[PDB]
Symmetry: D2
Subunit: 310 residues, 4 copies
């Protein structure tokens, strides 16, 4: 058995050789995860407060931005720190009422503003390709932490009896092919024409390409993403008239998940371009999101090009 | 706070006033659930063995039938018992690999054969309407036990820190209307014509009836059933050319879930008739299954009558 | 592995064949123990309230008497019950501050007053020889439950990860000889002359009788008793000028521990007579207490006869 | 609430400002403690192996010396490390069988031999006054970690439900006076004359100095030490004919506990001189040990000077 802390020390080459700093960052995340885990066994504010407090206590983060706050949070006494963290404290918290998987998503960037000064929104509006780390905690049948710093995706499972996260998968990679699609198909009529055509494509009979595909939609970004990463597949959250530019948050959800997806050998697109290369406009900016096996995301992109209407 | 054990003693009117016996039965189930819970934090055989051992140790069950065994199990030294239990020890165990919800389903009947003799398959082939109890354990973000003895559906949540199941919902009831459907829509082309038509019906635009409906499919009978019970909805597992008479087991899955559904004010059909009234043919008999809010199941039945082809 | 509940069902010959009732009684105790266990990982009132509530919820106890209450507690709606329980909810609670072992002690009697009426102090003032059950829960490095119903002493260890008590010792018996004594020797000068002489006797050099004996005094009746039961020894709590008739409670501590000691093959005396045969005078009556290996208790009794002064 | 990890980061002035290193060291200890904690809820080898593995995995310790090994252990690939650790993996493991408190003791030194080379016994034979850190983990009714780096004694309690150690006492100090003594008084006749005289002194009647003192002897160095630190007192483990120079290990037990005692305002002597100033002769060297409130240890020293015979 190898714990998360031991694994970090082992891979002192990742995170720009900043091992001590990564240990601190993930220790704050693991602490918040443990607190949230027990609390699950409203919660949004709770998770937000605990994670925020955990990060501030490590004296390594200058400030944070959260889906649960309109404005960024500048930590007093941490202006010397060079890291900022963006997070979705409790992804899909609505699933708590029905005992369905929920999760925490985090994204880490090196600040751009001068150290020793208060971080500004400029530090939080960098494109996803600037992330130095990203990950999620999935609170399902078991609690797991998955992260990347640009050198592969690593998975750890929390052992409640030992109170520690244990390594369970060092190099998480999408399988060569995907055969599952995840989307709220009930909203079929509301989706762009290209997405509707792709859904029909998924239902055709073609054994040579494993079609029709299997459908799976838990309704939790983290849970669906996690399953598709392990078994192969694609997750889709298109735009609709109600959400013309998508529903998912570009900064708190799309970017970190896109970083993880790419590090696992997958693709993350908004239907037309690479998520990680999008220039952020606002903290709460939304974006259409298609992520998973590259061939599947490529198919969605093709259908959107062939049937451009919304 | 009120524990499962205390609740049972409180409702000494249920289970034909056989309080001591119900306590014994659920104690065996709770024990097995606790063991399985920790083991999750292959498993099929494990869950089967632990539950079987737990039931035998309570000296109240003459024998059991399990999805994990071709033949029934007659407990030596328990021929004096008048109860038999049928179970699906670990529903959707495949979801374990992806950290998705799994569950245990149990069904209890009073034997028909003379006490003091070895139970036979006759005791396990009674129609669902003869069940004296049924329930499930859902191992999700939290572990919960749900059951009925014919007087409503009661829910309990396991508190790992106290090692006990606590009452969380005394009268589980489907809401007045459902607005969510759960099916592997990827297999659309393989389903009977009536089911295909119903799926399209679910996607129409009609705000007056909350359409289009929301789609949710975890891929776990227990997990999807549980969510739909709390929020309203319908779960569908139709027949296909590969499984002409459905995939779900009539005795280990359909009957117990149908009993729970009806006790919560819902409906459980195979598309044409009431699940609980079907006369069992074999231990492993399969059946098409549609369960949830009555109006939704009624709609499926109508579409099947209007479009009868497979 | 065999759980406490399964063990009880197995030994349906004990407790006057009242298996269902014993299960109920110990279930209340185990529940209270679990609650207290987690709360430890002031407390007196807490432990008292939780245990009292647990016993009342099982609808099998007419009332209780506790070291934490001047008057007995008559449970409304339980006048039909035939059992009464006396308890020391949190023995040696002062040890909590220093992380030292503490414990719960319980004693069970069949009421003497007519069923269907409110129990009176008469039901709680019966001599110890009338106990139908007695036991303790020791909250130490691990939490254990030990009990007897007149057919030997059985020990169970709580497994926090499974949330259940597991059998660890079916027939607890004092070894053939004891070689350890447990007393607050600091109060040597305050003890009766016979006790002082016995202490000196314990310190003599005589390998043939394993002397000098080893001294061990945790300061917790339950913890010291438990160790001496497993390894052999004697526990002494004599009278002093401050407590002329002893400090320990005859009904809440001495009687239940004496029942356990005798069932394990040991002896329990007040220095002159058998604890279980003493006729109670009041609910809070105190008594000198010497318990453990028979030969050691016999030695104390001899010294008290030979040196009678206080 | 403040965790051990957060506390360490907070006090970045201690441990020669080597915060990152202290975090690593205590993380290894906390991990081992968690593993041992669950294993308790033979063990000597287990505890030794887990702690040794934990320390090696942090890549910060060049090697260790343990009471469970005749020779020191040089960690391959850690010759670059500048710290060495000495430990008593499972103090009083015999108490496990009786559910009595046990503990882990650790001592940390900066190596004296050149970095980049294999540590030798020279690195492990430094006097106690050279320790840079020392501490213990007490596995009792609750699990606690206590440590010092020369700036006071800090206590933390393990919360099994959160899987983390929480600060509970920042500045542990002996009370102004002690009124409890801890010794195996059964061996009175075997002790040096001065110790026998001190024991009698403890039993005299003198309210002005809180005498007679209370006696408490759990039989576990860590447990007795911990209680005396919180409530005041003295722990004595004298020499005897069987152990002419004491029984406790100078390096694995006496030195670390002496460092803690002094940092809490107490005293630690072998009866004649300061434990921390003794020049080690061998890895397994033993020593008489008297530790606790200064006035009490001073009294023992006086009696030993006044009655010098063994």
């Amino acid at each position: 058995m190898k714990t998360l802390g031991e694994f970090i020390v082992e891979k002192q080459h990742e995170f720009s050789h900043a091992t001590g700093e990564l240990t601190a960052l993930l220790s704050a995340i693991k602490l918040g995860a443990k607190i949230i885990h027990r609390d699950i066994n409203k919660l949004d504010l709770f998770a937000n407060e605990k994670l925020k407090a955990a990060l501030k206590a490590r004296d390594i983060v200058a400030g944070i931005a959260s889906e649960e706050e309109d404005e960024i949070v500048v930590f007093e006494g941490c202006e010397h720190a060079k890291y900022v963290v963006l997070m979705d404290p409790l992804d899909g918290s609505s699933n708590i009422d029905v005992n369905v998987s929920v999760g925490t998503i985090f994204s880490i960037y090196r600040r751009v503003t001068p150290v020793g000064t208060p971080v500004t929104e400029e530090d939080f509006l960098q494109p996803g390709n600037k992330q130095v780390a990203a990950g999620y905690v999935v609170y399902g049948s078991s609690t797991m932490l998955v992260y990347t710093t640009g050198c592969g995706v690593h998975a750890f499972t929390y052992d409640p009896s030992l109170g520690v996260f244990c390594l369970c998968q060092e190099r998480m990679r999408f399988p060569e092919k995907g055969k599952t699609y995840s989307i709220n198909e009930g909203n079929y009529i509301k989706f762009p024409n290209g997405v509707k055509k792709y859904i029909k494509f998924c239902q055709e009979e073609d054994k040579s390409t494993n079609r029709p595909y299997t459908s799976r939609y838990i309704g939790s970004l983290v849970a669906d993403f996690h399953r598709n990463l392990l078994k192969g597949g694609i997750y889709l959250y298109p735009s609709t008239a109600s959400h013309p530019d998508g529903k998912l948050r570009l900064l708190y959800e799309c970017n970190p998940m896109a970083f993880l997806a790419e590090q696992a050998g997958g693709k993350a697109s908004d239907g037309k371009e690479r998520i990680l290369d999008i220039i952020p406009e606002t903290l709460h900016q939304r974006r259409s999101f298609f992520v998973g096996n590259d061939h599947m995301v490529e198919d969605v992109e093709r259908f959107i090009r062939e049937f451009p209407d919304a």
